[PDB]
Amino acid sequence: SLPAHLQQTFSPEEIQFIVENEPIKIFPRITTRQKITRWQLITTDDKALNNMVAMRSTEVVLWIALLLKQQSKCSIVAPQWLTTKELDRKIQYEKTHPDRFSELPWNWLVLARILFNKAKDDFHDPIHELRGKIQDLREIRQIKVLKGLKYLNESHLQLDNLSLLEINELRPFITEIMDKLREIHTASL
Amino acid sequence: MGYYDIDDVLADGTEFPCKFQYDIPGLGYLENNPGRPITKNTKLSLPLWLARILAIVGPVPFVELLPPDMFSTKVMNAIKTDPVALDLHSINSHFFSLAIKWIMLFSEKELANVVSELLLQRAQELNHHASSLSIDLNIATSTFLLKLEEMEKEIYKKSHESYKDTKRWMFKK
Amino acid sequence: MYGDLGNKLVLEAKRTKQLYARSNQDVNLPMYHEDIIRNILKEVSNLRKNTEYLKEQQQLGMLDDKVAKCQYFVTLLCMERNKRCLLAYQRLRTDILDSMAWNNNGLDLMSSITFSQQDTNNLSHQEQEYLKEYCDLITDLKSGDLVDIDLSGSLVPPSDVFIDVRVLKDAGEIQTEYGVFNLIKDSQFFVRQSDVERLIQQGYLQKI
Amino acid sequence: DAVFGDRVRRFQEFLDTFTSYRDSVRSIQVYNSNNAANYNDDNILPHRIIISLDDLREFDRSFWSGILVEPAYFIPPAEKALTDLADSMDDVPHPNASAVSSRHPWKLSFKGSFGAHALSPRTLTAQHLNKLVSVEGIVTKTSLVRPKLIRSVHYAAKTGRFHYRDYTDATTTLTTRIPTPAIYPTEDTEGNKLTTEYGYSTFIDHQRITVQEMPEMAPAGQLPRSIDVILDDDLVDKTKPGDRVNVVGVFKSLGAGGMNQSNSNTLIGFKTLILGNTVYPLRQMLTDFDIRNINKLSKKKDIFDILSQSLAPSIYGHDHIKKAILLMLMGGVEKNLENGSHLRGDINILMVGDPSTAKSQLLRFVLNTASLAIATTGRGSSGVGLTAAVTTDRETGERRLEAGAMVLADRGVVCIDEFDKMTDVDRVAIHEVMEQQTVTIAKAGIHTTLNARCSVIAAANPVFGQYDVNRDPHQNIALPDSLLSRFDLLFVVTDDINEIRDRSISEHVLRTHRYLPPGYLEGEPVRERLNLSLAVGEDPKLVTIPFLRKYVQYAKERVIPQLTQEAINVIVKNYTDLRNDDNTKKSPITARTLETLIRLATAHAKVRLSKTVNKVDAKVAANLLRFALLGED
Amino acid sequence: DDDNTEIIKSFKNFILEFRLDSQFIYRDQLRNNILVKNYSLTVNMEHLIGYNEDIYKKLSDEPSDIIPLFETAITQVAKRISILNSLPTFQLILNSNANQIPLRDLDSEHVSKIVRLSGIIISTSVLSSRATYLSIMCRNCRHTTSITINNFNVSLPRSCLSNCGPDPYIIIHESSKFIDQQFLKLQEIPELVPVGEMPRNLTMTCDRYLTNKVIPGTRVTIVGIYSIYNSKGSGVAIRTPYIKILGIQSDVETSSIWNSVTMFTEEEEEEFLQLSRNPKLYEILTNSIAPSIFGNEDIKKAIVCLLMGGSKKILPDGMRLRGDINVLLLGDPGTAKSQLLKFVEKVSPIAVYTSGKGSSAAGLTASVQRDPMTREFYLEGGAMVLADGGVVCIDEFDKMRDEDRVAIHEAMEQQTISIAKAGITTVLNSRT
Ligand SMILES: Nc1ncnc2c1ncn2[C@@H]1O[C@H](COP(=O)(O)OP(=O)(O)OP(=O)(O)O)[C@@H](O)[C@H]1O
Ligand SMILES: Nc1ncnc2c1ncn2[C@@H]1O[C@H](COP(=O)(O)OP(=O)(O)OP(=O)(O)O)[C@@H](O)[C@H]1O
Ligand SMILES: [Mg+2]
Ligand SMILES: [Mg+2]
Ligand SMILES: [Zn+2]
Structure with a gap:
């Protein structure tokens, strides 16, 4: 809260927490179907976890999936946007329109890093190609952010599709610059 | 209007030129002349926490505020010609706070149009230098950070720290 | 003139803030400034004496009122400036103390085992007292309705x-x-x- | 083509937007016109204006950016428009005999703020070529003024018509063109003989100066660097060696740069030059407020004491020497006498004393406070370096003379330190300058007499480490008598141990060492670097130094007192009393003491802003010389 | 052209595909350099060897021909990772860890090969201009033309392109681009000179971002190419060797002008402030002065005080006060007086050691020399000019001649040197 800044900005670890508080799909390697000890969770619905059958698709929260993959009882399926084809489509869309941001999920960087670190085996494409494509996208997004920073004023800004980490790393500069501009304008009234 | 702000307290203690409009005895320690009483039409440099109030109470007030040296036509022309290269630290270490103060006391639309542009054009260079995280395997940064106002150093430090934490978390293995 | 000394005190505060700002780990407050503070106390006492003297000298009716108003305002403004400087210094030191008190899992700090971050003699006696009641306040917070949650945790x-x-x-x-x-x-x-x-x-x- | 005409139209609009330039054009035009109509004359203003870059910045940002960034494509269009406006203003006809051939086109000069274009001869690199820049420095060398051909006119027989040929050079114009061989045409197109008609052709004066960096701003362990500037037309002979100048012009490349028929070499690069547009000297003009203050402060009775004490407020004591320095600043009146003689009006002072007696810190103060001052050290100087040196002019090819320290300080002061440590061969030359005030050069076919009218203040040490009172004065000073006779005031200063003096002087020194410049925090090192921001806009009581400079200038240039009889009566009685006494003085008294009294009286009369020498001036001169010779104080 | 394209492609793939752990270091360095307007790139040779040995072998045998291809690969990658164009051709700076070759071991066997060597800078020349983009026009047909030049050693065409003369072409100086060239002189390390031989000197050339980086007296390490240029010495078919600098490592952090700015990363600043807080830092600093000398504690404390130095003040009236300390040691033989002078030389960032017997006033303050070519007079620095902002250690001070010793009086206190010789009248700074 108070120590180490934290007054008005989130740390990267808290952003990671928020990201891991989101659902994901898995392929269980165990069967916990009730016969013809139970999970009984208090913050997430446990219906899927209680009723599990092997070699079938279910969805749970992300951190439970990581805890299961720590053991040998899970296999997380990466989202469909984590593919070379779908990344090359977004790169082209990014190139063609130099005044809007492409539509990527608000956790693409954090999810990509977490999945590359933990579930390296589950990817179908080679991981180095995807890692290069992520950097290729990030550089162009940085160029567009740098160009858009010139239009700062006292009224309001619109950043339609900027990601969570990109917003977090830029908030202290943007807010303070516009605050100072607003004070300068208000003083002259 | 921050009572406990340290930087506001420091910036509020700067000396501004002013002229006495009355003739009054008993003063003189303002001039460092204890026994000598002050005369009429005398030009002295008084601190801002005193000159601001002495120019309000009288009607004609006791003291008239004179145009400052830091808001001359030369400084405005230098600001307009090249904002980035200008050394605001040499002009005054608290340029912006005194600028908004001067705009508040005397409504000046011209100064509000120049200070805003100066800040907007210097923000780009501030961001460029703050985003440059070194990689282990320049003279520009050292030269530029010696021309920064007291207020701009805080923004530079905040932006730099945020960028370093983001980079650290991204590449933690 | 009168307040020119107090500015120095404020300057010292700024330096402390830097040590607070550039702190990878917890730091210790420097030595107290009782001598400078006592100097401002002496000069504000002299200002009070001057205001009294102006009061009598006006109420015997030897001086014009418009004349006396100016020095009255000057003395009042100087006292206000000195109060502002002292209060700002005190509040900064108080905030750092509160931060340390929170960052030791409550406890009585100096009386019990401490993390050796701070020496006893740096703090003033009133600051030492303030720290004690603040720690007691943290303690009887931690026993409130939020027993299950450790308010002094990570x-x-x-x-x-x-x-x-x-x-x-x-x-x-x-x-x-x-x-x-x-x-x-x-x-x-x-x-x-x-x-x-x-x-x-x-x-x-x-x-x- | 189209861009040229568009830019001409833009500048034409700029000219009638601001009416000041149009009024200055008319003022110059009417002055030149009505000057030529004065047949019974009692001289000619050049065709050049100074425009502010600032106003152009509000008017048209694009044109201002073009001038600052790409001068070679925006200055020539502006000059044509200015010439057109000037031609339009001149309604009166001028059917002159030969002015029809030479138009003398109007040119431009700039002022205002240059932003990042204000540099020095060291921070100027290949990134600034073909840009408008301003450089600050000190002039070291200048070339001789030569005429250069710009257009030639020839007359053809059997036809009676004239034909003209134009010439251009790399330094003449801002745009590269096909070169010209500078050979006069001899044959007409039809083969008729052509005769050159001087008096209708056009020639322009050409000069080249060298500007060096200020040595005080050089980095550690490095020597100052210099650059070359070319001046033409009306800019010639506006600078002299030793001057501090600021030159605004275009930084330009020239030549072939070894990329040609010559052999390939890594040691060959291009040559760089500056085509100066304007020169500004870095004489303080006085307003009526300043003059009124000077006249009001003149009437105060104790003005001499205040003026003398205001000198070097960081030195404790030495009141009489500080009075003597002030009297040096306001020199005496020089008398030109028959037989081609002149009585010198300069006051020369020598200081002999013990080590660490603040002798060298007064010479440094005189260097700064005076209008013209040249510093010299005994062991690091030569005779050829003080009078003149024979050198060569590379640009034209002749052999010429280069000024030395003494002749560069004409109507100035020379401060010599460690004067006794100078070699004998060196010390003879200074003798002549102290006596005739002229230098004679008879070397290498250059027979010339050079004027050197300078005041000498010098500091030396006795033969031993410290002054001895048990030995005769001549034994203490190693200088010869002939040299010693040429100094008006010799001050022997001694450090004597006394507890009260030590307590006072130590307190003063400790107070001085605790000074903090405004805008600096405690413990903050002084940043004597300016961060490359050379300039922001390119063009008991004590008195402040600039006011003293104004006072000295006004006194030197506005009052010339004359001697009176009642002052002579005091001077003669003082001289007769001093001559006939048994007191042992540190220097002999001779018939040249009377001239010293006269000069000191004249100087004190100038201090009072009066046109006559009074009795009080004689009394002050007598007291000063009695203190100097006797120490009776 | 069918091999240069593949070479450029290989270099671009090296720049874009090299990764260690989880970060593209060479891709990030380019973007960070572009932001602060640094148009250059530094590459470590070990990474290049690890990535692909064929690429390293291509560079190691044909440097002058291959290096420009890497130069254009860098600026092709930059325009892709920076722009969706006022970007000049970038610069390549190389780092090597190979064995160092002495200057006197360089011979005809090492021509056109990249070498690594160390020496002492003795002189630095002034900056000169070299053309990169030349705009050209013909004297008769008058049409525009352009030429592009790289500084890795060209002339205007000896013909006409579309009668015109033999080689008719002139340079349009406006709209032409130039860069910065500097010449430096090297010398051997004093301890590596062979027996009975005087030290030898060598010539080096630096460009663009490697100019104004060293000062005379500095000990440096140089990575460059050993080449020859025909010029001008009655020998037949002989050439003069020189070195084109590619990388410079300098011990002193100071640049040419000594910006008086911090060149310390936070990781070193934290160490320095931690050191400053030691309660017994004075004893630690004293014990570090000549640990092989017994006793003499007060002299070592005085040496520490001299090394740190005092403060300097400027006053409103123009007065200047000295802030440096001078020390004299007058003592008996065998008391380690001369073993402290040579230690102070080593420890000080800038220091000169001289002997009073072999000295002169011109050599100590400044000299005046005549240029053989220009035939004018110029000033050359001396012992007190080189040792500016540092320390000069004068041994055998009692044996100095009385004429030479008196020349130091002004420099010791007024910290200036006045020269009034041969039409040159200047005052030079000297704070030592
Ligand atoms: N009266 C004084 N007031 C202030 N400072 C003084 C005085 N006398 C000497 N000093 C100080 O002594 C120091 C040396 O003085 P300075 O260099 O002028 O002496 P000097 O007469 O030229 O000596 P030297 O005979 O060694 O050439 C300076 O720091 C100067 O400030
Ligand atoms: N206190 C000491 N500790 C260690 N070695 C010492 C000491 N005193 C002298 N020496 C040794 O004595 C030798 C000679 O000393 P050095 O050359 O410094 O003499 P010096 O004082 O310069 O003499 P000189 O007055 O004759 O020039 C060296 O080998 C040095 O190491
Ligand atoms: Mg001296
Ligand atoms: Mg020895
Ligand atoms: Zn042709």
Whole structure:
């Protein structure tokens, strides 16, 4: 809260927490179907976890999936946007329109890093190609952010599709610059 | 209007030129002349926490505020010609706070149009230098950070720290 | 003129703030400034004497009112400036003290075992008293309605169930809920993160 | 083509937007016109204006950016428009005999703020070529003024018509063109003989100066660097060696740069030059407020004491020497006498004393406070370096003379330190300058007499480490008698141990060492670097130094007192009393003491801003010389 | 052209695909350099060897021909990772860890090969201009033309492109681009000179971002190419060797002008402030002065005080006060007086050691020399000019001649040197 800044900005670890508080799909390697000890969770619905059958698709929260993959009882399926084809489509869309941001999920960087670190085996494409494509996208997004920073004023800004980490790393500069501009304008009234 | 702000307290203690409009005895320690009483039409440099109030109470007030040296036509022309290269630290270490103060006391639309542009054009260079995280395997940064106002150093430090934490978390293995 | 000394005090505060701002780990407050503060006290006392003297000299009716108003305003303004400087310095030092008091898991700080971050003699006596009642306030907060939640716990989110830790200082056997840890120096543990948060916070363990 | 005409139209609009330039054009035009109509004359203003870059910045940002960044494509269009406006203003006809051939086109000069274009001869690199820049420095060398041909006119027989040929050079114009061989045409197109008609052709004066960096701003362990500037037309002979100048012009490349028929070499690069547009000297003009203050402060009775004490407020004591320095600043009146003689009006002072007696810290103060001052050290100087040196002019090819320290300080002061440590061969030359005030050069076919009218203040040490009172004065000073006779005032200063003096002087020194410049925090090192921001806009009571400079200038240039009889009566009685006494003075008294009294009286009369020498001036001169010779104080 | 394209492609793939752990270091360095307007790139040779040995072998045998291809690969990658164009051709700076070759071991066997060597800078020349983009026009047909030049050693065409003369072409100086060239002189390390031989000197050329980086007296390490240029010495078919600098490592952090700015990363600043807080720092600093000398504690404390130095003040009236300390040691033989002078030389960032017997006033303050070519007079620095902002250690001070010793009086206190010789009248700074 108070120590180490934290007054008005989130740390990267808290952003990671928020990201891991989101659902994901898995392929269980165990069967916990009730016969013809139970999970009984208090913050997430446990219906899927209680009723599990092997070699079938279910969805749970992300951190439970990581805890299961720590053991040998899970296999997380990466989202469909984590593919070379779908990344090359977004790169082209990014190139063609130099005044809007492409539509990527608000956790693409954090999810990509977490999945590359933990579930390296589950990817179908080679991981180095995807890692290069992520950097290729990030550089162009940085160029567009740098160009858009010139239009700062006292009224309001619109950043339609900027990601969570990109917003977090830029908030202290943007807010303070516009605050100072607003004070300068208000003083002259 | 921050009572406990340290930087506001420091910036509020700067000396501004002013002229006495009355003739009054008993003063003189303002001039460092204890026994000598002050005369009429005398030009002295008084601190801002005193000159601001002495120019309000009288009607004609006791003291008239004179145009400052830091808001001359030369400084405005230098600001307009090249904002980035200008050394605001040499002009005054608290340029912006005194600028908004001067705009508040005397409504000046011209100064509000120049200070805003100066800040907007210097923000780009501030961001460029703050985003440059070194990689282990320049003279520009050292030269530029010696021309920064007291207020701009805080923004530079905040932006730099945020960028370093983001980079650290991204590449933690 | 009169307030020119107090500015120096404010300057000192700025330096302390930098040590607070550029602090990878917790730091200690520098020495108190009782001599400068006493100098402002002396000069504000002299200003009070001057205001009194102006009061009598006006109320015998030897001087014009418009003349006396100016020095009255000057003395009032100088006293206000000195008060502002002293209060700003005091509030900054108070904020740092509150931060340290919160960052030691409550406790009585200097009376009991401390993390050796601060020497006793740096703080003023009134500051030492203030710290004691603030610690008591933290203590009777922690026993409020929020007993289950540890209001003085760690503020970094939990994201690793099992961690590797290394012992820094030697100790004896310590019982924990459902088990025992034997703190032989230069030994490594692989255990759940929740059990060793307390011991890492107190410097008996390393890494995470 | 189209861009040229568009830019001409833009500048034409700029000219009638601001009416000041149009009024200055008319003022110059009417002055030149009505000057030529004065047949009974009692001289000619050049065709050049100074425009502010600032106003152009509000008017048209694009044109201002073009001038600052790409001068070679925006200055020539502006000059044509200015010439057109000037031609339009001149309604009166001028059917002159030969002015029809030479138009003398109007040119431009700039002022205002240059932003990042204000540099020095060291921070100027290949990134600034073909840009408008301003450089600050000190002039070291200048070339001789030569005429250069710009257009030639020839007359053809059997036809009676004239034909003209134009010439251009790399330094003449801002745009590269096909070169010209500078050979006069001899044959007409039809083969008729052509005769050159001087008096209708056009020639322009050409000069080249060298500007060096200020040595005080050089980095550690490095020597100052210099650059070359070319001046033409009306800018010639506006600078002299030793001057501090600021030159605004275009930084330009020239030549072939070894990329040609010559052999390939890594040691060959291009040559760089500056085509100066304007020169500004870095004489303080006085307003009526300043003059009124000077006249009001003149009437105060104790003005001499205040003026003398205001000198060097960081030196404790030495009141009489500080009075003597002030009297040096306001020199005496020089008398030109028959037989081609002149009585010198300069006051020369020598200081002999013990080590660490603040002798060298007064010479440094005189260097700064005076209008013209040249510093010299005994062991690091030569005779050829003080009078003149024979050198060569590379640009034209002749052999010429280069000024030395003494002749560069004409109507100035020379401060010599460690004067006794100078070699004998060196010390003879200074003798002549102290006696005739002229230098004679008879070397290498250059027979010339050079004027050197300078005041000498010098500091030396006795033969031993410290002054001895048990030995005769001549034994203490190693200088010869002939040299010693040429100094008006010799001050022997001694450090004597006394507890009260030590307590006062130590307190003063400790107070001085605790000074903090405004805008600096405690413990903050002084940043004597300016961060490359050379300039922001390119063009008991004590008195402040600039006011003293104004006072000295006004006194030197506005009052010339004359001697009176009642002052002579005091001077003669003082001289007769001093001559006939048994007191042992540190220097002999001779018939040249009377001239010293006269000069000191004249100087004190100038201090009072009066046109006559009074009795009080004689009394002050007598007291000063009695203190100097006797120490009776 | 069918091999240069593949070479450029290989270099671009090296720049874009090299990764260690989880970060593209060479891709990030380019973007960070572009932001602060640094148009250059530094590459470590070990990474290049690890990536692909064929690429390293291509560079190691044909440097002058291959290096420009890497130069254009860098600026092709930059325009892709920076722009969706006022970007000049970038610069390549190389780092090597190979064995160092002495200057006197360089011979005809090492021509056109990249070498690594160390020496002492003795002189630095002034900056000169070299053309990169030349705009050209013909004297008769008058049409525009352009030429592009790289500084890795060209002339205007000896013909006409579309009668015109033999080689008719002139340079349009406006709209032409130039860069910065500097010449430096090297010398051997004093301890590596062979027996009975005087030290030898060598010539080096630096460009663009490697100019104004060293000062005379500095000990440096140089990575460059050993080449020859025909010029001008009655020998037949002989050439003069020189070195084109590619990388410079300098011990002193100071640049040419000594910006008086911090060149310390936070990781070193934290160490320095931690050191400053030691309660017994004075004893630690004293014990570090000549640990092989017994006793003499007060002299070592005085040496520490001299090394740190005092403060300097400027006053409103123009007065200047000295802030440096001078020390004299007058003592008996065998008391380690001369073993402290040579230690102070080593420890000080800038220091000169001289002997009073072999000295002169011109050599100590400044000299005046005549240029053989220009035939004018110029000033050359001396012992007190080189040792500016540092320390000069004068041994055998009692044996100095009385004429030479008196020349130091002004420099000791007024910290200036006045020269009034041969039409040159200047005052030079000297704070030592
Ligand atoms: N009266 C004084 N007031 C202030 N400072 C003084 C005075 N006398 C000497 N000093 C100080 O002594 C120091 C040396 O003085 P300075 O260099 O002028 O002496 P000097 O007469 O030229 O000596 P030297 O005979 O060694 O050439 C300076 O720091 C100067 O400030
Ligand atoms: N206190 C000491 N500790 C260690 N070695 C010493 C000491 N005193 C002298 N020496 C040794 O004595 C030798 C000669 O000393 P050095 O050359 O410094 O003499 P010096 O004082 O310069 O003499 P000189 O007055 O004759 O020039 C060296 O080998 C040095 O190491
Ligand atoms: Mg001296
Ligand atoms: Mg010895
Ligand atoms: Zn042709």
